[PDB]
Symmetry: C3
Subunit: 227 residues, 3 copies
């Protein structure tokens, strides 16, 4: 159920909150329209994460789902978060590399399917089916990481060194971090309950904060965001 | 509960409906692609408002939420409306002033959070928490009004007199009207039930019709929408 | 109820699935950014259709709605599908014809209302009201078909013969196919239950597969998608 993980939810709420304030209080005197975009995108990521983490701490983002033969605690707020949040992160990567509109649309589409499909899995009552959705969701993710690693890097090679190197760091951080989510999900309370909801919430928190605040920090503190 | 406010819901449905028909039957012979955008955006605002007002009149947009120690009548359709509707209005303002993509994204993002956060508050069962969400939602709104008043006006000063003056009127109308919503919400059935759902529905109706049909009228009947 | 139509749901799932794989394994070596857009848009249509068809086969996309004086089986997954799917198809048509942003926004808006309004109708408990929503939804559709037939054709006349002719075929296929949906809905389980859910699911399947895979095939196998 949901009570002992309250501390990781409170800390996540706090970290996303402070992360938003910091990015806000840093893009204030920015005149460059390109940099402006990066700050707007990057600042909204933790801001959204803040509201959803708060809904989980306060209990609104938690529901109960029966499967296997029990009532399981499912924090559905994560999907609401990730639905807008993961595409924004992808958008940062795309602008940095100047991706084609077509690929940006393919990426956002793949991402929406990944999260939507992951949400359906989390709320499915037939235990066995949850894993089918997990598989579809993971296939979507793999497609996204493939394009960022192989497709985007190539695109980054045509920009100036500052941009190419910052993209490289951001690229490595998201590929590694993003692939941990399906694993956490599979072994957590949403799948084979090997790991307790307590530790699971701590894992997602570290992952979320790293994939947003950290990512944001690496990006917003480089000159890559400038023309 | 919901029954005696049926008249304000029926009138709102009617006014949004006639408002859509009028804007539609006015943008028919418009060749200017810029003006076309304004008509498309502005016409969809009342059209959406029409469908949601109708759902409330017919009872579908009403739900019951327990909090304090009672079953409260919450018209959730408003948020569904405002979720697409408020950003469209912001988009009209942005095109008129030729805002940067970055700021447009920040505004739409702030707006989505404002409505989403306001929806969560309206459906929260812990009476005390509803106000936390209200606070977050209001902070988001204040951020939006700040940019429209101080940021956009500056941008409008670089356009021709017709555009600058129409923007000024639209700006004053939305800043004043938008700030009334959180007050109505706070004192209405969603917050401290000082005002009866009856009078509350009448307030939102006047506010909604003014902020859409009125706004649309001020905009679509000026030459500001032309290049 | 839902059980005997499982075969049409399984076949639809299969066809959308194979349809996605085929389009994916065809746009692989495409360098043209314009063609790229078409492949991205067109491939995502069946991909989304796949996930929603699967949710219906597995039972998640089915709910029960009381109206008339009974518990009716309503596959709500269709709307989730169509909400993103119909606009994407419209986007293909718009790019092919190089439509104005204003009209694209009017079309997407009309489309969202059509599906949203159709969803509300499908879930409404007052039998009589369901048809009011159906009427509003159909009016929205008629507005869309009008613009595609009369507005877009004109726009297509200014492109080269390959584009104009492919647009013509796509135009005829969507106008005819799209208008069948409201009829199926009206006579199916969502409206006057003249046709059994069994036959209804078979009708939507043929319509869906034709309006996506077929449409995609006609488009992706022509040179129209190139500059
Ligand atoms: C403009 C865009 C293009 C915007 C579009 C936004 C929208 C489409 C996003 C949807 C996102 C999806 C992914 C999340 C939905 C998940 C869905 C499956 C879960 C839905 O459930 C929650 C929903 C409704 O809450 C409820 O109200 C109903 C009506 O009154 C009730 O009938 C429900 O029961 C009620 O559910 C709540 O309460 C349940 C309680 O049960 C009880 O448990 C307690 C425990 O102590 C006790 O046991 C009781 O006895 C028992 O009864 C609980 O179980 C439920 O979980 C739930 O709390 O909520 C709506 C949420 C809203 C949509 C969140 C918004 C998210 C944020 C703010 C979005 C910011 C987005 C902007 C748009 C991004 C901008 C950037 C872009 C430009 C890129
Ligand atoms: C393409 C885009 C990018 C589009 C995305 C669109 C989508 C994400 C928008 C979401 C918007 C959000 C903000 C609204 C959701 C609020 C949410 C919390 C509330 C959800 O509840 C309603 C929902 C489901 O209805 C229900 O069906 C279920 C399944 O069958 C049932 O299990 C539920 O119970 C049922 O709920 C209804 O009935 C309840 C009844 O209870 C009873 O009360 C009676 C009273 O007499 C009596 O007491 C009975 O005994 C008792 O049981 C009732 O309480 C509930 O409130 C409810 O009526 O509804 C889905 C709504 C749908 C999403 C509305 C669409 C809005 C319009 C048409 C959108 C137009 C948008 C276009 C996209 C804009 C284009 C412009 C852009 C380009 C900028
Ligand atoms: C980024 C974007 C801009 C993205 C936005 C996405 C979002 C807003 C889309 C919303 C789309 C709308 C149109 C669909 C919503 C319809 C809505 C009215 C119906 C909602 O109900 C389902 C919902 C929740 O499921 C449930 O969880 C709750 C919490 O735990 C429970 O309280 C509910 O009860 C539960 O409902 C399920 O179970 C019910 C079971 O009852 C039982 O029946 C069995 C039968 O054997 C038995 O009798 C039992 O005893 C009895 O109790 C069942 O009746 C219900 O129907 C339901 O199964 O589900 C959330 C779905 C999720 C949103 C689907 C996502 C769709 C796909 C993957 C989208 C891909 C999109 C990308 C974004 C497109 C990209 C392209 C663009 C760029 C153009
Ligand atoms: C604990 C918290 C996490 C909880 C908070 C609740 C929160 C969920 C609600 C708040 C909404 C929030 C999510 C909104 C996100 C905004 C974010 C995306 C913004 C990123 O930033 C994008 C920029 C766009 O810039 P511009 O306006 O276009 O400026 C043009 C300039 O004039 C040069 O033009 P030139 O090129 O021609 O030379 O935002 C506009 C730049 C402006 C010019 C400057 C604006 C300054 C701000 C108003 C002040 C900064 C905030 C404060 C330090 C405190 C924040 C409090 C909070 C409650 C709002
Ligand atoms: C009671 C009611 C509230 C209930 C109604 C239900 C409602 C919810 C469903 C309807 C959907 C509705 C919401 C859709 C909104 C549409 C709105 C946003 C449109 C705004 O308008 C945008 C324009 C885009 O213009 P274009 O097509 O691109 O024209 C280009 C021209 O050829 C010049 O080109 P050049 O530059 O090269 O010289 O719409 C296209 C312009 C067209 C060329 C002209 C179209 C005319 C219309 C078809 C007729 C107008 C409507 C009728 C008077 C009656 C309406 C009935 C209703 C049921 C539809
Ligand atoms: C929601 C709140 C919790 C969060 C509020 C955010 C606030 C603390 C920070 C605002 C920062 C922003 C001004 C950034 C500085 C930019 C820098 C160039 C300085 C210029 O800022 C100075 C002026 C513009 O100057 P002008 O040229 O004369 O035009 O801003 C005009 C500034 C105005 C004086 C402030 C805007 C007015 C708001 C309407 C007031 C909001 C506070 C409410 C009183 C709180 C009610 C809560 C209640 C429940 C207790
Ligand atoms: C049974 C199934 C239905 C179930 C599947 C589950 C599914 C729901 C989840 C998968 C997500 C899926 C929906 C995603 C849709 C993607 C689709 C929209 C893509 C359409 O395609 C758009 C392109 C964008 O192209 P680019 O990257 O920008 O290439 C630029 C080039 O370098 C030239 O540049 P120049 O102009 O300068 O010269 O996608 C990128 C092009 C790449 C360069 C090439 C990519 C190749 C692919 C990685 C391999 C193709 C797929 C495989 C055959 C098998 C698919 C398995 C599935 C599980 C993913
Ligand atoms: C949903 C309805 C409630 C609302 C319907 C809207 C309608 C009343 C208004 C349409 C206005 C639109 C034509 C605006 C005028 C533009 C002006 C330049 C005149 C040209 O309009 C003339 C022609 C195009 O001429 P073409 O050059 O030969 O090509 O439009 C071709 C016009 C066609 C004759 C009309 C489109 C055909 C539709 C398929 C018919 C829709 C009505 C159904 C019979 C209603 C069934 C409801 C049932 C439940 C009772
Ligand atoms: C700020 C949040 C971030 C960066 C979240 C990333 C999330 C993912 C990559 C989630 C992926 C999932 C799967 C591949 C399968 C199972 C379910 C999910 C949704 C956890
Ligand atoms: C057509 C509708 C319009 C212009 C609606 C505007 C709505 C707002 C500015 C709503 C703001 C709210 C808050 C700031 C806090 C509490 C809840 C809301 C959603 C009523
Ligand atoms: C891939 C799916 C396609 C092309 C779906 C098209 C759907 C429509 C044109 C649906 C229209 C409807 C109405 C006009 C009224 C009643 C309800 C609907 C949603 C079935």
């Amino acid at each position: 159920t949901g009570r002992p993980e309250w501390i990781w939810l409170a800390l996540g709420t706090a970290l996303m909150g402070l992360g938003t304030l910091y990015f806000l209080v840093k893009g204030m005197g920015v005149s460059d329209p390109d940099a402006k975009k990066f700050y707007a995108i990057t600042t909204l990521v933790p801001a959204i994460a803040f509201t959803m983490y708060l809904s989980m701490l306060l209990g609104y983002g938690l529901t109960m789902v029966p499967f296997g033969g029990e009532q399981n605690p499912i924090y559905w707020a994560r999907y609401a978060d990730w639905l807008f949040t993961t595409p924004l992160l992808l958008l940062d990567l795309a602008l940095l590399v100047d991706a084609d509109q077509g690929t940006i649309l393919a990426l956002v589409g793949a991402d929406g399917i990944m999260i939507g499909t992951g949400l359906v899995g989390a709320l499915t009552k037939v235990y066995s089916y949850r894993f089918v959705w997990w598989a579809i969701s993971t296939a979507a993710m793999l497609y996204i990481l493939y394009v960022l690693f192989f497709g985007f890097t190539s695109k980054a090679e045509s920009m100036r060194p500052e941009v190419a190197s910052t993209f490289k760091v951001l690229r490595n951080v998201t590929v590694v971090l993003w692939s941990a989510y399906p694993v956490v999900w599979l072994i957590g309370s949403e799948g084979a309950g090997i790991v307790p909801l307590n530790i699971e919430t701590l894992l997602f928190m570290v992952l979320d904060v790293s994939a947003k605040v950290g990512f944001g920090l690496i990006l917003l503190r480089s000159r890559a965001i400038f023309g």
